[model samples]
Target: INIFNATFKISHSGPFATINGLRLGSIPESVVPWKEINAALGQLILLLATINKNLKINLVDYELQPMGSFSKIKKRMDWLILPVYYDETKFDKSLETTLEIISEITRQLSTIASSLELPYIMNKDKINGLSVKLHGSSPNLEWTTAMKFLLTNVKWLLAFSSNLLS
Candidate 1:
């Protein structure tokens, strides 16, 4: 058997006689590798730092948190293991907010791509981390390429954003 077989799980231990140690999370296949996700986020942050200086108004006011892997909530639940009810809507609302934020960031990236008339980076290849050195002075060919790769990475995440939303 493959030790890293793809799967999803959610369990909680709760009772009336004891304190609630209810923990919840999801495990999923490496449909999209973790490196790409965090790389995309990091790339966006670094590039945005540059964009803020290039443009009149600075962008990206909040913190940039690294993303975890795909979070799937299968429609079926093992009630015998967790006889408690979870608020699906609550989970959905937060996820929705995350998506919206990422979406707006992507929109900003696309604006850059259009100005350069460059094609979107279509490679699914792995990439290195980013640095802020010698960036943010102005837009150049390399900067355009950076925006392209970032947009492509964001596309993958948004593509699988609603994965197994149950």
Candidate 2:
């Protein structure tokens, strides 16, 4: 995964949501509560769904089931559950703007990726470029676990990018 230091590249000040909450002109505690974080994630899913509606991704697929005895019975019996639906037209403008926002996100990711040299971090007793190593694998482990280990290198690079970008 590529890592780059780009603080000298982009120029952006803290947005008001971050800056205005501080008492001493210092970095404010910007943590949103878990409920609020979940709400925001829901909003992001809705936004993405509207933007890529043509792609037909089902955002409501992850909604929590109704909390009641009837639903509990259905869950035990493996019954099909339904989700609440709203009219798609209501979010048309959001769909357009979501595309624009995602385009910028893609551009930022591309800029960051193109600006660095990447080194792989290994985990399976094999030392890769970054001196990272992993112990013996579980005998019956799925390939997904290995893929996740590799993805950690991507996350490491993104962390570096985030430090520079922020």
Candidate 3:
């Protein structure tokens, strides 16, 4: 089995800002509307769903709540399962599975990121700073970073698979 995963940092700029719930980061003083934040989250959700469809795998589990003064979001995903193979037959099967997993995840991240029109300001470098009055900060908070992390891990796993097969 394989697990595909991703995360995204979302922020909104507008009037009537409210920060509440399990705050992972500091909220800006400006009135960044929660509604806009929700919109951003929607975009992320759409992208995730699209990736899942393209990869033919379920990659994420997410729950977003609107009851709080500020929006609350929680997300998670599992990782691929790889086993050591001692024989040539087993090694061949394992290699095939590993390649499929890697290809699916790569296709997902590339396609999803390309589909969305990332806020213009956020287009620079690996980390993009949004122009919205309330903008998401930190490269660690971006979804692309999550994709990159997953991709990197998959590559390492592939190398490990190679060693085992040898």
Candidate 4:
């Protein structure tokens, strides 16, 4: 089995932001919004479980901090370190499953956001609004460009996984 640990951080700035039952207050009195963070993490675990039966993912630890002031408005940041493990005998298979799970979840999320007229977190900027970062996977890129690659090439990943199994 191969074990990989990565820190996933999701941060956003806006007024009365709500995601999956998680809410953040607006402006000067803006808070960390721990409820939203927990809800997001819970949803992630459930989504991953739907894809792989043997895969194990743990929240491990987390932190919530301020992201400084932008236009005098407070921004909140949440950091979560998740440890994931799965059998390596079929590594590519596992990767394919994970990618499919992410894609499906992202699609559903987009639909909900569109219906609610909310900002899509995945498309948010790396600086100001929303952003997701994967750490401990690679160096040279703080946010790990590998995530972008995986997201953009899901079909290629599926093909590669099939080849590996063959």
What is the alpha-carbon lDDT for the whole of candidate 3? 0.31
RMSD of each: 20.9, 16.8, 17.4, 17.0
Q: What clash count goes with each model?
A: 0, 1, 2, 0
Clashes of 1: 0
lDDT of 2 by residue, 1-166 (tens): 2222221111112321111121101122332333332232233333333323422223221222322211110111234332211112212222222223333333444565465322443432221332111122211122222222322333343344455444
Name model 2 segments beyond 4 Å from true: 1-28, 54-166
- Computed on alpha carbons, the lDDT of every model, listed in order, comes to 0.29, 0.28, 0.31, 0.29
lDDT of 1 by residue, 1-166 (tens): 1111111111122210100111221123212233443333333333333333333222343332322322221222231111011112432322223333344445554564455222232222212232111121322333223333434444343223222111
lDDT of 2: 0.28
Write the number of the candidate with greater TM-score, choosing between 2 and 3.
3
Tens digits of per-residue lDDT, candidate 3, 36-116, equal: 434433333333343445444443433323222232333333533322121123322222333333444444455544541
Q: Compare the candidates by TM-score and give the number of the best one.
A: 3
Residue-level error in angstroms, candidate 4, position 106:
7.9
TM-score of candidate 1 on Cα atoms, chains taken together: 0.24
Report the C-alpha displacement of residue 131, candidate 4, in angstroms. Answer: 3.3
C-alpha lDDT (0 to 100) for residue 13 of candidate 2:
27
Q: Rank the candidates by TM-score, best first.
A: 3, 4, 1, 2
Worst 10 residues of 3 by lDDT: 16-25
**Given candidate 4, what's the lDDT at residue 117?**
16
